[PDB]
Amino acid sequence: IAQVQVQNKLQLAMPLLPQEVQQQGVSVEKSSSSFLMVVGVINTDGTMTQEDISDYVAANMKDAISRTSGVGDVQLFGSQYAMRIWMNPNELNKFQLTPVDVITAIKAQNAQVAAGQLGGTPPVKGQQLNASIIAQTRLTSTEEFGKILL
Amino acid sequence: MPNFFIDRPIFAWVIAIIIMLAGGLAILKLPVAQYPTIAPPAVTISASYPGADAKTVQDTVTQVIEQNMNGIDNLMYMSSNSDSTGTVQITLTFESGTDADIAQVQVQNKLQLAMPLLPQEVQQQGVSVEKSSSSFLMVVGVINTDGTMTQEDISDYVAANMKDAISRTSGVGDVQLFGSQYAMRIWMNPNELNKFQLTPVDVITAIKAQNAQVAAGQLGGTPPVKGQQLNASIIAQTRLTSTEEFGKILLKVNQDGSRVLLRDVAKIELGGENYDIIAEFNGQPASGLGIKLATGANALDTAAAIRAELAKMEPFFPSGLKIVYPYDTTPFVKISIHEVVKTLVEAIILVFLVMYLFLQNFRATLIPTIAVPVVLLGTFAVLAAFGFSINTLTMFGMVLAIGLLVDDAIVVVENVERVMAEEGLPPKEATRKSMGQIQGALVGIAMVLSAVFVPMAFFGGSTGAIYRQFSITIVSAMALSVLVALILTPALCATMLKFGWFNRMFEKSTHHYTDSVGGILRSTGRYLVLYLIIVVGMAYLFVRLPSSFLPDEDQGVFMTMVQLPAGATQERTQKVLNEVTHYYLTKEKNNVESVFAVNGFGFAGRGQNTGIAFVSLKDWADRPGEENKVEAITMRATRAFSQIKDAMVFAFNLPAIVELGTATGFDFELIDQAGLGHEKLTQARNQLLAEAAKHPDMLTSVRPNGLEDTPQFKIDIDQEKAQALGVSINDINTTLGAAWGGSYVNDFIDRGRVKKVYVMSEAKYRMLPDDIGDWYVRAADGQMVPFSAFSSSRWEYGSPRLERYNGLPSMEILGQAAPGKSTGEAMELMEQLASKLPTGVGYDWTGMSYQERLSGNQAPSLYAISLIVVFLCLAALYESWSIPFSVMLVVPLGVIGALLAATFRGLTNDVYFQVGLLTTIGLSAKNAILIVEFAKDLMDKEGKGLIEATLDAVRMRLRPILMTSLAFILGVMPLVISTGAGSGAQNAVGTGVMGGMVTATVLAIFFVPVFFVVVRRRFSRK
Amino acid sequence: ADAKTVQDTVTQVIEQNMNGIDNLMYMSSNSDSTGTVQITLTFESGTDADIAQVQVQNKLQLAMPLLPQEVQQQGVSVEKSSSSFLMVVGVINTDGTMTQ
Amino acid sequence: TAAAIRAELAKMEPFFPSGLKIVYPYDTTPFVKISIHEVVKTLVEAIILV
Amino acid sequence: GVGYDWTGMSYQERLSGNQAPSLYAISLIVVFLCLAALYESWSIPFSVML
Ligand SMILES: CC[C@H]1OC(=O)[C@H](C)[C@@H](O[C@H]2C[C@@](C)(OC)[C@@H](O)[C@H](C)O2)[C@H](C)[C@@H](O[C@@H]2O[C@H](C)C[C@H](N(C)C)[C@H]2O)[C@](C)(O)C[C@@H](C)C(=O)[C@H](C)[C@@H](O)[C@]1(C)O
């Protein structure tokens, strides 16, 4: 209950938060103060980095140890990956572009967009043939993000 | 106690008046519903993304939400769907008795924080969490008689006048509309539109400012000026309220003195909210309304009250709003509970019909007639005390144990009126001595029957509770009898007692059988075996018999599932639904009442190429010959349909309990455990699938429950291109989007209700790829540009239904054990067949095959303990690590006969037969305790001995073991064994006991005394 | 508000949904004319308030998406509720160094 | 709760990459076990000492 | 087209009244039986409750 209440009065401030701080996601938990246990993840092959060993864990194991009943909190000892676009301010300056530009680009060029259907949801006269119209999908590599058009 | 109560019997009427009073009060305040709560609580989160595709829906929404279902208690697993209709369904199933009211909160609360990461367009339609309880009370259905009204019309009237009307009716816990509810359509036109240099975006951003609604103060109100005489509210802009009112919208003003209306560019017209489901009823436009119970409600009271509130409005119903009831549970529950109660009422007459025929008396028979409806029509109080509810399960729960609380009335008043009769005292003083002989062995059977029953409602989960009902009703009935048999009846027949053509014909037949009983005891080796060979026949018979849950029963309705191939169309689907429609009507009107036919939703998917047919039968009256029933009709349907070209049209009967599991197969999930793609998992699946068919030794039908990939129409927006022309990706996308996908602009008020406003091209200018051309978009310049200018178009494959298990891409596999092996072994194989699959692919078991896995088969483990609480209980009733062992070996004798309804009848190991097979052992062992008492009893009291006392026992004892065993095989063998009206269970209850209640007497009399002889003597060596 | 166009726009929806919650006894509501709604749900004497509160909040989750986006920006508050103040601790400044 | 955390990990180990190993740097469960299960040894051993 | 009901103090109050008959009855009935049990007779309690 307590949790239910906290979250319910929180919910009233939710629309008053900075768009950014919503985007991150607020969180409400009922956890013990202190760690029950810490689960370690190593690579013997030396084949992976810290960099990877985190991201693996996050993508591949965190999510469910989280949804596992009795786990009120999970701390990740690292970060899962993200598409990183380390801007360069001179480089940006030469071609006469701000970070705003970069952003607007990434936004519209890395999208996933419902373009409806061939079969029409309501149709005509009498028609066979019905298929999904598939517009843009989300870029999914360093390589693709790179090829953006500024 | 019984001695104390015989002397004060005036009180022992009070004790019984209450049991009654309270037993009655419960009856007159108990929940009645077909079944109780048996599925684990589930919570489905479901969302819409107007015109998406599995991929989009998945990575734009379903993923997001999953990545947030953490910190929620008692979750078993999470299942999720993303299909090409723009729809997501995520179902969190929760441990057994997790409170579902607080499991929904938790889910939903964790969702509200995710909401801001879903797309602004999903957030609009709104994601929503309900409690997954696919257990419909009934489904009404408003049809229009004359061809006046449409789907969307009927729909609108339904959710507008009657919807809330029902919603607020005494015991409806959920109402769910079966159609749209009028919505403001604005069916654009690329040409009417491209001519005025406008795109949809421009249409979009008008409905907005033209249809908004903005504030402005009062007058005084907020701080006024010194001394004011007037304060009243301003009313600025309102929202439009008509098709015509909408039609009139400024869309742009050109140098010409002329502008553009909204009407001019498109077709304004009120109409439906969503167009892919076609509710059609007996050919006619329908638009029903499904209704769920309420929880503590009454499937019969509210059943009525639906029909009441449905009247009142039938005056107000226009042209032809003739309401139909193509599915109601109410009848089935009534004329199954107006049975059952019938069986008791009757099995009562049977105990009065015997009794007389065995004891000339009237005041003898007229005591169990005032002892059974005490216990029985009063154990209801214990039920109602524990939250239980009058239902199929708990109802039979008694019928299955009526014989065990009869044999408690007969048994006492027997050895009272044939203890005085066998030369002795008056009435009071007889009951006093005669009770002192049974007094103990009732308290013995009490604890011994708490065992062999209680260790049930300790079982699995989904079928754990299925059992528990049985267990608790019985132990409650059983314990209440042992009480009235120690308080009321044994202080009643002491103040009530004292057919002719017969009587002496029994007194000859006792000695006639006591012939070989009195023999064969010089050395017992053939009788010691044969038993060892009954223990086998059974052990060979146990295994043979196939297992199952509650058997399919002829409920009012049944279903036909039409599935058109890959790219098919609702229209291509209707024509098939139209044959189904027809075959059923004119070709079966002596059994078929109606077909409620929905296309645009099926089983494996929610396609346009799918449909389902709810056919609801004639009343059970007009359905006489057994081939006028379900099992037959489906057979005659399923075949007659295996003739439509491309269109799998199967017909099938609803299962036992709708919202529970199913046929003892498996539910198997194939998971993706590295970044392996769809197009990689799909192979893995196909390997296994093929590798699974190769072993028909245990397979039947291994299959994907999903859908195979289909062709789809990619549109690749060239970026470079778009920039060089004055053309914006956002303008592009939206028009492609809104033309074809549709888009919810905002809301408006129509006839005092809020209703959506959708905007989307006519269907004329959105059917074929060759149709794209049509659509143009304004630019930097202000010039209309074709997609041809800035896009390529190519065909390709993409799943139209993507699936995930526990936030990890899944594909669900269904399959049975194949006529032959055990549910368990199939699973056992499948697992193996899965080990060889390409690295990074995993499996999990769900639903029915999750229950089986995490709930072993506690029968052996549990009944080990019961069978030990028995010896332990039983021993100390007597005084021996020995004597109880003579009672125990009575088990096999009832197992057989019951098991031997594998022979004479073609049935299975039901949950019913599983529990009748307990009420049998109850009598079996009880005899074994009475006979084995009467052998140790007068072998101590009169002081007799050896083979004399064992004969002395079965002597004064036999007749009861006859009166009752007869009473049962009568009261348990009516329509219970040989039926037609909610049969199934009836038959499974019956054959269970009946045959097997045979061998549990007419095989135990010649036997138990053997059991008291071979034991005792073997515990005295040299 | 616009009073009529606040009821029907918000209250008809919230009300549609409070359909069928354990021990509901009587619900009563009012629009306003400053744009204000108080739906109240009164549950059977004895019933558990905190659960009541939960279901009331569970059915709202369903109404919620179907209400003006400015009404959403606002709140829609679901909570247990009395009717009468237990007390009214007032507060005055002696020696006017503070106004109302 | 540890019981399961251990079974969720279990369930997902057959699919890690190259040489990716779980390791148990810290846990307050094992002590809490040994603890009661040696204080339960003090029951038996001290009855077999009466 | 114009109906009525009570709420608040009223609804409680009304529902106190409607109930009373049921109260006294089932209460008397309970006293009768309590005497039958106790004072051995099926109709001396019939005589106390006079
Ligand atoms: C041993 C090792 C752990 O230390 C503790 O357990 C001590 C004993 C807690 O106090 C213990 C004991 C106690 C009484 O706090 C003094 C109690 O209030 C808390 C909930 O648990 C501390 C300090 C808590 O902080 C307190 O959090 C409160 C919500 C408010 C308080 N504050 C800023 C005013 C603040 O100091 C809190 C949450 O555990 C700190 C967070 C950062 C942790 O999870 C860190 C990693 C801890 O697990 C720990 C360092 O590993």
Q: What is the 3-state secondary structure (H, E, C) of B677-735?
A: CHHHHHHHHHHHHHHHHCCHHHCCCCEECCCCCEEEEEEEECHHHHHHCCCCHHHHHHH
For residue B203 the two structure tokens come to 């249409």
**How far is the C-alpha of B705 from the C-alpha of B71, rounded, in Å?**
30
φ, ψ of residue B613 in degrees (nearest 5): -125, 110
Bridge partners of residue B139, in order along the sequence = B290, B327
**How far is the C-alpha of B811 from the C-alpha of B805, rounded, in Å?**
8
Which strands make up the sheet holding B791-798, listed edge to edge? A114-117, A132-134, B710-717, B791-798
Q: What is B133-179+276-328's CATH topology?
A: Alpha-Beta Plaits (3.30.70)
CA dihedral E21, E25, E30, E36 (to 10 degrees): 170
* Residue B601: partners with Cβ closer than 8 Å, 6 or more residues away: B277, B610, B611, B612
Are the Cβ atoms of A134 and B715 closer than 8 angstroms?
A: yes
Contact yes or no for B960/B411 (Cβ under 8 A)? yes
**How far is the C-alpha of B345 from the C-alpha of B809, rounded, in Å?**
57
- For ligand 1, atom 15, the nearest C-alpha belongs to A33
For ligand 1, whether the C-beta of A33 sits within 6 Å is: yes
Assigned architecture for domain B555-659: 2-Layer Sandwich (3.30)
Residue type, B48: S
Contact yes or no for B781/B684 (Cβ under 8 A)? no
- Strand B841-845 and strand B753-759: the pairing is unpaired
Helix spans in B371-525 (H): 372-385, 392-399, 402-414, 428-450, 464-484, 509-517
Residue with the two structure tokens 């449409």: B150
- For ligand 1, atom 6, the nearest C-alpha belongs to A34
The method of structure determination was: X-ray
> Shortest CA distance to B174 belongs to which of B255, B260, B293?
B293
Q: What is B499-554+847-1022's CATH topology?
A: Multidrug efflux transporter AcrB transmembrane fold (1.20.1640)
- Within chain B, which residue ranges are assigned CATH 1.20.1640.10? 1-37+329-498, 499-554+847-1022
Domain A79-150 grouped into CATH 1.10.1200.10: no
φ, ψ of residue B503 in degrees (nearest 5): 55, -55
Assigned architecture for domain B180-275: 2-Layer Sandwich (3.30)
> Shortest CA distance to B314 belongs to which of B154, B137, B162, B182?
B162
Residue type, E26: I
- Within chain B, which residue ranges are assigned CATH 3.30.2090.10? 180-275, 710-798
For residue B912 the two structure tokens come to 């019913």
φ, ψ of residue B616 in degrees (nearest 5): -110, 130
What 3-state DSSP class applies to B808? coil
> Shortest CA distance to B714 belongs to which of C45, A113, D43?
A113
Ligand 1 atom closest to residue A35's alpha carbon, by position in its atom list: 48
Contact yes or no for B368/B355 (Cβ under 8 A)? yes
Last residue before each break in chain B (C–N > 2.5 Å): 498
- Within chain B, which residue ranges are assigned CATH 3.30.70.1430? 38-132+799-806, 555-659
What 3-state DSSP class applies to D20? strand
Helix axes B729-736, B200-211, angle to 10 degrees: 80
Q: Tell me how many degrees the CA angle B497-B503-B508 measures, rounded to the nearest 5.
A: 130
Query: Regarding the domain with residue range B38-132+799-806, which homologous superfamily does it belong to in the CATH classification?
Result: Multidrug efflux transporter AcrB pore domain (3.30.70.1430)
Residue with the two structure tokens 């699936």: B803
Helix axes B911-931, B891-898, angle to 10 degrees: 140
Residue with the two structure tokens 């526990």: B806
Chain C residues with CB-CB distance to A6 below 8 A: none
Integer-rounded Cα Rg, in Å, for chain B is 36
Residue B361 CA: distances (Å) to CA of B72, B251, B497 = 67, 98, 8
B interface with C, Cβ–Cβ < 8 A, is 101-102, 104-105, 108, 112, 124-130, 163-164, 167-168, 172-175, 213, 215, 233, 235, 238-239, 294-296, 747, 749, 752-754
Measured in Å, residue B157 CA sits from the centre of ligand 1 at: 59
Residue B87 CA: distances (Å) to CA of B35, B274, B717 = 31, 13, 25
Q: What is the resolution of this structure in A?
A: 3.3
- Strand B174-177 and strand B128-131: the pairing is unpaired
φ, ψ of residue B338 in degrees (nearest 5): -80, -10
What 3-state DSSP class applies to B615? strand
CATH of domain C1-81: 3.30.70.1430
Contact yes or no for D4/A37 (Cβ under 8 A)? no
Q: What is B660-709+807-846's CATH topology?
A: Alpha-Beta Plaits (3.30.70)
Q: Positive or negative CA dihedral for B200, B202, B203, B205?
A: positive
Are the Cβ atoms of B674 and D15 closer than 8 angstroms?
A: yes
Integer-rounded Cα Rg, in Å, for chain A is 23
Are the Cβ atoms of B567 and A129 closer than 8 angstroms?
A: yes
* Residue D41: partners with Cβ closer than 8 Å, 6 or more residues away: none
Give the number of other Cβ atoms within 10 Å of residue A2's Cβ.
7
- Count of A-C CB contacts under 8 Å: 13
Query: Residue B688: how many CA atoms within 13 Å on its side-chain side?
Result: 32
**How far is the C-alpha of B868 from the C-alpha of B888, rounded, in Å?**
10
Assigned architecture for domain B1-37+329-498: Up-down Bundle (1.20)
For B56, the enclosing helix (H) or strand (E) is helix B54-57
- Max Cα–Cα distance, chain A, nearest Å: 67
For E16, the enclosing helix (H) or strand (E) is helix E8-17
Q: Tell me how many degrees the CA angle B367-B369-B370 measures, rounded to the nearest 5.
A: 65
* Residue C50: partners with Cβ closer than 8 Å, 6 or more residues away: A1, C80
Helix axes A2-10, C49-63, angle to 10 degrees: 40
Task: Pick the residue from chain D with its C-alpha nearest to A50.
Answer: D20
- Within chain B, which residue ranges are assigned CATH 3.30.70.1440? 660-709+807-846
User: Which mutation among A28, A30, A33 tests ligand 1's pocket best, with the greatest number of atoms within 8 A of CB?
Assistant: A33
* Residue B620: partners with Cβ closer than 8 Å, 6 or more residues away: B335, B980, B981
Chain C residues with CB-CB distance to B174 below 8 A: 19-20
Contact yes or no for B973/B892 (Cβ under 8 A)? no
The full DSSP string for B492-554 is TTTTT----SSSTTTTTHHHHHHHHHSSS-SS-STTTTTTTTHHHHHHHHHHHSPB-SS----
